[PDB]
Write a protein that binds this DNA or RNA. Structure first.
Ligand SMILES: [Mg+2]
Ligand SMILES: [Mg+2]
Ligand SMILES: [Mg+2]
Ligand SMILES: [Mg+2]
Ligand SMILES: [Mg+2]
Ligand SMILES: [Mg+2]
Ligand SMILES: [Mg+2]
Ligand SMILES: [Mg+2]
Lengths: 239, 213, 239, 213
RNA sequence: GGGAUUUAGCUCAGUUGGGAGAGCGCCAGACUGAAGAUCUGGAGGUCCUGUGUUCGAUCCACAGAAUCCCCAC
RNA sequence: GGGAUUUAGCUCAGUUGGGAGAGCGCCAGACUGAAGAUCUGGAGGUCCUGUGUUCGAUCCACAGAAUCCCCAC
């Protein structure tokens, strides 16, 4: 007869994935470029950075594309309580994005926890990057089919059956070359921490000493996670 | 999948209680009044109303006081999925409140599901209102003695009963008996007609059951 | 890094449904009559009664058919802890059935908790009784198709697509009249408590006094739960 | 559906610990010895082996002492569904044990999942073995002083350290230092070759990690 | 609604920033015919956790955890 | 591995079975110029929960819950 879900806990490592609820209806039509708008993509990335920076929570890094963000945690607040983490994080992101996009009508993120083994972490972000690719192809495919004259649900149903390579070949034949499009559209964006060597004055030693500062960086030209270039890339992020 | 809680569910009826994460620290840094603020109070109520009207999740009514809101659901959104309900509702409220107060820095609500039986619904809101009262007296007692620091005010407030807090506060120009009802008892936003009630009765001395019909 | 599921709790009213895991392989071939064996059905019913009687747990009644049993609880042991209840109950049932069937090879029940509103309880047992009916029709349908010459998986796949009335009509045309078969096969069995007025001696009063004794009874001729006869039947059980 | 926990899951690796529900009360009523019984001990070990061999769920190995068994799973059965894993395993063990002891009255195991990290697997079994030792000394101290009642034996046993329990038990013809290793440390049943080890080492003074490979 | 506590096995100090101590207790030693007591040496540290600020954090900032308590009930 | 506790707002009694009490405290009353103290009356009960046994359960049987504690760590 109580708050029975409040004792549900998760154990690190854990990924939190937040996804915009019905964003193509709640963020339209407010003048966003179709099919992609870099202003929105930047807002998503900045939202992720603001969370890492000032939420008080400490995710290692973030991977965002479309309207979703995945945060990797090796340490969890609220003793790993699922309700606490999902609600607070989704609420912070909803608020932050509302500010950066200067919205006048409310939006919402959902949130869910993905329990992983340490060794499984590269596999998770690979799966999400695959989703990013299909999202990328389907978005441009939808944009083309709609403007040519196909109905909203006709184009929607059409793309869900077709595979990623098929729609890609379709855009090809229509004069739409996806290989020229920016990397952030195709592979998404990484928000992580990188080391920065600095110099300060030890008033005692009377000398200059070297220390390190971890600064938050957005990478808009990331590699393919499952590749010879991508494996050590992810490996360094996860450390 | 590895989404091991994603299909954890609740059954109707259910109550979602959302509570502002560290609001008193945050909003004070923005210039809001303590322990209560009318502008914030209206924003909370408007946020609740906007949720009832615009979320599409259709709660019966909401009860709000301080920085918390409780929603009663008789029909369940998102197939009763706990993670989705807690996160989406908390996110909507966070976004809505941000808009109402036009904040320039992000805030956050938490959210939990209270799996009540139908018989216990009036009991829950009664206890919430009791909490509203104890918080009303305690926070006014504390945040008035701080005009003296944290541990000083608390140590000063140790063991003195409610009536003594009233008399103590009155000598320092604070009259608990005449402060607005939204501070003492909270605010009800209910349902198509949506109404805010800023002068509610005490719950446990039939009003609620009649409200739920 | 702990027993994180041990604080998962449920709230009454609740139905526990236990179902035999792979029973048609783990209980075969030990000479059971096909497609139905009343010895097995009695073992299931007696297992349910033994649980109500001597497990220390207090379900109101039980509904069993095939290899499943549903117990209605209005009060829960272990503070409603899901892991505790599922494991202990399934273990008790597995042990009890092992005894009554005199098994030499181990079997297993699964178990799951069904959270209900008080008003929803008749709906649950209706759904299960529907399942009992489909189970009944499909069992006889499978028995007929197999003996006629159809393969194990051919007959299995065949029945899953066909509806209950269709297979029923099939048995009809084959000379198999399901309407003549016993009620326990078609609708299952209820195990519940009924009041029994008794008489004892108050040594003080020197007179005979009347008190009540709740005795556990098996009903092998139950009505259809969703009918004018069935609604008050269930209503009295749930009280 | 209303099966609100049916899709709650865990991830590998995981440990299932099953513990006999009220075994000491039950099995004593059947004539078994207290606090330990060789016949019961063999039945527990055989039950564990039979599970590893015949369940199809394929655990790496099992550690048993008293009336509990811990199984290590590196690959998850039933898609990691908690309710199904706890119930089916507990049911299998209950059935298996019933067969091994040829009981005429039903018994029951409980079961819980211990969501350990891979790093912590040796730590878990070490703590379990520590529990095995503390239970070995305590139960022998208690169930020997009862030959004197419940509260008497406990009150008698209050505050006396382990060494004092040893000396106390020796004067009454009970030598803890020479009792079998399966009482002191427990039994390992591991893996295709399945082996029972009734003379195991102390875990935390590399054996386990080598066992898990 | 609020406060306090968290540091060696145990009970507790640490100048609001320059690499953390005491007392019981434990180990060893001598005092010597031997203990027991007392002196000496020794061992014991996730300064509750995470992230920041800083040349540097037990200490400050942000966000958390656990325990006790006031109010309330 | 074990023990103990659970009863009025609070602290606690109840013959191992015939419808549960005390003390603080509260309410009222008098003692009277008034309190404060003391006498009187009064109010307060999920006898922790569920199911059994019994004509009858705070009490016995079976199974649970919460808190404290020993052992262990
Ligand atoms: Mg979306
Ligand atoms: Mg999306
Ligand atoms: Mg708050
Ligand atoms: Mg609050
Ligand atoms: Mg089955
Ligand atoms: Mg079945
Ligand atoms: Mg046990
Ligand atoms: Mg045990």
């Amino acid at each position: 007869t109580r708050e029975i879900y409040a004792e549900m806990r998760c154990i690190p490592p854990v990924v939190l994935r937040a996804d915009g609820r019905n964003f193509k209806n709640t963020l339209s039509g407010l003048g966003f470029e179709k099919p992609y708008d870099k202003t929105f993509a930047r807002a998503m990335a900045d939202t992720a950075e603001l969370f890492i920076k000032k939420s008080g929570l400490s995710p290692l890094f973030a991977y965002t594309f479309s309207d979703e963000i995945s945060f990797l945690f090796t340490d969890l607040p609220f003793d790993g309580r699922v309700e606490k983490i999902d609600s607070v994080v989704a609420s912070f992101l909803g608020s932050a994005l509302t500010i950066k996009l200067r919205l006048e009508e409310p939006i919402a993120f959902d949130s869910r926890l993905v329990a992983l083994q340490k060794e499984e972490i590269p596999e998770y972000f690979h799966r999400r990057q695959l989703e990013a690719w299909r999202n990328f192809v389907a978005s441009w495919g939808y944009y083309a089919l709609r403007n040519e004259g196909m109905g909203r649900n006709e184009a929607a149903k059409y793309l869900k059956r077709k595979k990623e390579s098929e729609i890609h070949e379709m855009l090809f034949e229509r004069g739409i070359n996806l290989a020229t499009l920016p990397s952030w559209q195709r592979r998404g964006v990484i928000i992580s921490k990188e080391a920065r060597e600095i110099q300060g004055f030890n008033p005692v030693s009377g000398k200059e000493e070297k220390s390190l500062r971890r600064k938050i960086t957005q990478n808009w030209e990331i590699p393919k996670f499952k590749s010879e270039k991508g494996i050590p890339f992810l490996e360094k992020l996860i450390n």
